[PDB]
Amino acid sequence: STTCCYRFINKKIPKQRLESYRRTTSSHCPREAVIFKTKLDKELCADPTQKWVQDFMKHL
Amino acid sequence: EARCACPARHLNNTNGTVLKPLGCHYFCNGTLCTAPDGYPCYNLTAQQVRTLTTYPNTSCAVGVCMKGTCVKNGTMEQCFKT
């Protein structure tokens, strides 16, 4: 609930590089964000206003 | 940059405004990151940080990050930790 993203992963990350983790940050965060996890177990901040994401979340 | 694309805990408030971090620095991976310039923030005194709790108990200075400093803008909020 209070976890927020300061900055986003700009370039698309291939689906083969991401795990199944998905969490949407609070609507009260300065920046609207969805959180994914790489297969290296790193949490990464993503802009839901990027069609690269809307595609991935649909895929999940 | 990409390295600092990681989430961190923000503080909450009873004012109905956006959540905001303590200062403009945060820890991701093996990088101590700096919030982007323009990013909103809370600038609390050493004393205010010492007594920071799960309920509002001091007026919290709202600010804007600029090169790692939370520059106070004048607005005060009832911030708290969750």
Q: Which residues of B touch A (CB under 8 A)?
A: 1-2, 4-12, 18-21, 26, 29, 33, 35-36, 39-40, 81-82
List Cβ neighbours of B47 (8 Å cut-off, separation of 6 or more). none
Identify the domain containing residue A35 by its residue range. 1-60
Q: What is the dihedral of CA A16, A21, A24, A26, to 10 degrees?
A: -140
Please state the separation of Cα B47 from the chain's center in Å. Answer: 15
A 10 A CB-CB count for A33 gives 24
Classify residue B39 by its DSSP letter: -
Q: Which of B25, B8, B21 is nearest to B69 (CA)?
A: B25
Classify residue A16 by its DSSP letter: G
Question: Resolution to 1 decimal, in Å?
Answer: 2.0
Residue A27: phi and psi, rounded to 5, are: -70, -10
Q: Which position has the token pair 């007026």?
A: B59
Three-class secondary structure of residue A57 per DSSP = helix
Q: How far is CA A20 from CA A4, A16, A41, B43, in A?
A: 19, 11, 11, 37
Domain coordinates in residue numbering, chain B: 1-82
Number of structural domains in chain A: 1
